[PDB]
Amino acid sequence: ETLVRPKPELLKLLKSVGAQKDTYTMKEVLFYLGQYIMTKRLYDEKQQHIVYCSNDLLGDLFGVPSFSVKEHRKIYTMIYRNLVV
Ligand SMILES: CC[C@@H]1CC[C@@H](C(=O)N2CCN(C(C)=O)[C@H](C)C2)N1C(=O)C1=C(C(C)C)N2C(=N[C@@](C)(c3ccc(Cl)cc3)[C@H]2c2ccc(Cl)cc2)S1
């Protein structure tokens, strides 16, 4: 539905997992974010609800060393701090 426009650095991250537009639905952003987390192993097998993104571009952009996958609104907050008109 509605389109969001990533800042350059987030756009960089999305493109590193094969994205090729300037604008995306939130659903597409989360798809690519998932791909990025899985292909970079940004988690620990013993804690499957936590993304560990400290010392990764993703942590720089989201401004946190880890976050919970069950905390959806905060995930949207962090994405929105990386969005532009
Ligand atoms: C944080 C990633 C977690 C840890 C392990 C792995 C997982 O369950 N498995 C399944 C079990 N397994 C094996 C080897 O059998 C592996 C450990 C892989 N895993 C995931 O697959 C998850 C995924 C992958 C598709 C990325 N997601 C999850 N919530 C998902 C469904 C999700 C959560 C929140 C929101 Cl808003 C949207 C989607 C998705 C995801 C997507 C984007 C972001 Cl930023 C965070 C999470 S939980």
Supply the CATH number for residue 63's domain.
1.10.245.10
Element (H, E) at 10: helix 8-16
The experimental method behind these coordinates is X-ray
Tokens matching residue 63 = 């401004």
Element (H, E) at 75: helix 72-80
Give the experimental resolution in Å.
1.9
Neighbours of 38 (CB within 10 A): 11
Element (H, E) at 37: helix 26-39
In degrees and rounded to multiples of 5, residue 56 shows phi and psi of -140, 150
Print the domain residue range for 67.
Answer: 1-85
Whole-number Cα distances in Å, 34 to 6, 13, 85: 16, 11, 24
* Residue identifier of the C-alpha nearest atom 23 of ligand 1: 34
Amino acid at 45: E
Strand partners, 66: 52
The alpha carbon of 29 is separated from its chain's Cα centroid by a whole number of angstroms, namely 7
Does residue 13 contact residue 29 with C-beta atoms inside 8 Å?
no
52, 69, 80: which to mutate for ligand 1, most atoms within 8 A of CB?
69
* Residue identifier of the C-alpha nearest atom 19 of ligand 1: 48
Does residue 79 contact residue 2 with C-beta atoms inside 8 Å?
no
Q: Total domain count for the chain?
A: 1
